[PDB]
Amino acid sequence: SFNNINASISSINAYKQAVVSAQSSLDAMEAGYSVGTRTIVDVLDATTTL
Amino acid sequence: EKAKTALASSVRQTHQLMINSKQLQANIEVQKIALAKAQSDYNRRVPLGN
């Protein structure tokens, strides 16, 4: 049980980092679409990943 | 008759230069289009960098 608690902590940290990365990618994709360099399928895919 | 033929030849030749002008104008148009493309591309990309 003790080892399981520790593993849970580490996994939480990893998932937070992943969330931040996905948010950055979505922001990039949205800005590109706003300036007209990208379609709306890319925006929807980024939203799904987030 | 020799002189008349010479005059005809010269008048024909001067026309070849008057048309090369239009050719070079078309080339200028192509270059303007390319510059416009590059400028549009950069204006699209600038906000993302900020």
From Swiss-Prot, chain A:
The record's subcellular location field reads: Cell outer membrane
User: What protein family does this chain belong to?
Assistant: Belongs to the outer membrane factor (OMF) (TC 1.B.17) family.
Effect in UniProt of substituting residue 33 to F: Partial channel opening. Increases sensitivity to vancomycin, by allowing its passive diffusion across the outer membrane
Please describe the quaternary structure of this protein: Homotrimer. Part of tripartite efflux systems, which are composed of an inner membrane transporter, a periplasmic membrane fusion protein, and an outer membrane component, TolC. The complexes form a large protein conduit and can translocate molecules across both the inner and outer membranes. TolC interacts with the membrane fusion proteins AcrA, EmrA and MacA.
The annotated consequence of gene deletion is:
Cannot grow on efflux substrates novobiocin or fusidic acid.
Top-level division of the source organism's lineage: Bacteria
What protein name does the entry list? Outer membrane protein TolC
Record annotation: effect of changing residue 38 to E: Partial channel opening. Increases sensitivity to vancomycin, by allowing its passive diffusion across the outer membrane
Q: What does this protein do?
A: Outer membrane channel, which is required for the function of several efflux systems such as AcrAB-TolC, AcrEF-TolC, EmrAB-TolC and MacAB-TolC. These systems are involved in export of antibiotics and other toxic compounds from the cell. TolC is also involved in import of colicin E1 into the cells.
| Coiled-coil annotated residue ranges, if any | none
Q: What is known of its domains?
A: Forms a continuous, solvent-accessible conduit: a 'channel-tunnel' over 140 Angstroms long that spans both the outer membrane and periplasmic space. The periplasmic or proximal end of the tunnel is sealed by sets of coiled helices.
UniProtKB/Swiss-Prot annotation, chain B:
State the superkingdom.
Answer: Bacteria
Subcellular compartments = Cell inner membrane
Question: Which cysteine pairs are joined by S-S bonds?
Answer: none
State the oligomer form and interacting partners: Homodimer and homotrimer. Part of the tripartite efflux system EmrAB-TolC, which is composed of an inner membrane transporter, EmrB, a periplasmic membrane fusion protein, EmrA, and an outer membrane component, TolC. The complex forms a large protein conduit and can translocate molecules across both the inner and outer membranes. Interacts with EmrB. EmrAB complex forms a dimer in vitro.
Stated family: Belongs to the membrane fusion protein (MFP) (TC 8.A.1) family.
Sum up the protein's function in the record's words.
Part of the tripartite efflux system EmrAB-TolC, which confers resistance to antibiotics such as CCCP, FCCP, 2,4-dinitrophenol and nalidixic acid. EmrA is a drug-binding protein that provides a physical link between EmrB and TolC.
Q: What is this protein called in UniProt?
A: Multidrug export protein EmrA
Annotated source species: Escherichia coli (strain K12)
Which residues of the whole protein are included? 102 to 151 of 390
